[PDB]
């Protein structure tokens, strides 16, 4: 797709920590915009585990391929994929990472993953009201299996968090989300799950035909995360 920023003027500039007369945080709103322009990714609970899949859209030959990993591990049993401002995502991810370690070193085990996400969420929410500082313009989803079972959560710049059966984020959210909204199959076995997924991913962003090379990872109850190899993903491609 063609790229270019026609707008270069500051234009309208509200302020920070100010509700609009209609009860809205415009800054948090503008933040959301940034994440809409991000890459597209999704994940869904299946058989006895959960998978993650993102559209790895590459440009130059000169990029170090794989090095542009979109799906990142926070720990062997839990990962997250993100979209929006790259820098903000990164730092936010590292926070989750250490945060995860903390619970492990104090309680001896990350029993409930829901909690890990709540913390990073709270981090984000702080910037939503604490005066002099810019909100994190990134949305990300955590998924993996904890003591309770296979889990999937998403988080937006406002610090909002929810649990899904399946969901997506980034540019093609609306599209891909609708596809699942209709064709999502409950206890779909992995092989088919990834299929339904890649299909859904396709339809969405695939206004531009070529799906390119998606990045896919999955974890099933009982064991650690598995990242699909170039060939394995291409198989479903």
Q: Whole-angstrom Cα distance, residue 124 to residue 139?
A: 10
**Cα–Cα nearest to 198, from 219, 172, 222:** 172
- Minimum separation from the CB atom of position 212 to its own copies (A): 17
- Cβ-in-10-Å burial (0-12, 13-18, 19+) of 191 comes to exposed
3-state secondary structure of 153: strand
Q: Which is nearer to its own copies, 37 or 235 (CB)?
A: 37
Q: Which is nearer to its own copies, 34 or 211 (CB)?
A: 34
**Cα–Cα nearest to 56, from 39, 36, 38, 73:** 39
Q: Which is nearer to its own copies, 132 or 208 (CB)?
A: 132
Q: Which is nearer to its own copies, 184 or 228 (CB)?
A: 184
- Minimum separation from the CB atom of position 139 to its own copies (A): 12
Q: Whole-angstrom Cα distance, residue 172 to residue 191?
A: 23
Q: How many residues in the chain?
A: 237
3-state secondary structure of 69: coil
Q: Whole-angstrom Cα distance, residue 237 to residue 211?
A: 8
Q: Which is nearer to its own copies, 30 or 195 (CB)?
A: 30
- Minimum separation from the CB atom of position 75 to its own copies (A): 18
- Minimum separation from the CB atom of position 179 to its own copies (A): 11
Strand partners of residue 216 = 53
- Minimum separation from the CB atom of position 235 to its own copies (A): 26
């Amino acid at each position: 797709g063609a790229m270019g920023m026609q707008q270069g003027q500051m234009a309208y500039d509200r302020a920070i920590t100010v509700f609009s007369p209609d009860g809205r945080l415009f800054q948090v709103e503008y933040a959301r915009e940034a994440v809409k322009k991000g890459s597209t990714a999704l994940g869904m609970k299946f058989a006895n585990g959960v998978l993650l899949i993102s559209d790895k859209k590459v440009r130059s030959r000169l990029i170090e391929q794989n090095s542009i990993e979109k799906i990142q591990l926070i720990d062997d049993y839990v990962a997250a994929v993100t979209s929006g401002l790259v820098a903000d995502a990164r730092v936010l991810v590292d926070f989750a990472r250490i945060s995860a370690q903390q619970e492990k070193v104090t309680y001896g085990s990350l029993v409930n993953i829901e909690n890990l996400v709540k913390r990073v969420a709270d981090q984000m929410q702080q910037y939503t009201q604490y005066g002099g500082v810019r909100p994190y313009g990134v949305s990300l989803i955590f998924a993996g299996i904890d003591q309770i079972g296979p889990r999937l959560f998403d988080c937006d710049p406002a610090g909002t968090i929810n649990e899904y059966k399946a969901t997506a984020i980034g540019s093609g959210k609306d599209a891909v989300v609708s596809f699942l909204e209709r064709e999502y199959k409950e206890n779909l076995p992995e092989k088919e799950a990834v299929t339904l997924g890649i299909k859904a991913l396709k339809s969405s962003l695939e206004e531009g035909e070529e799906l390119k090379a998606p990045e896919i990872a999955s974890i099933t109850v009982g064991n650690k995360y598995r990242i699909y190899d170039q060939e394995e993903v291409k198989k479903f491609l």
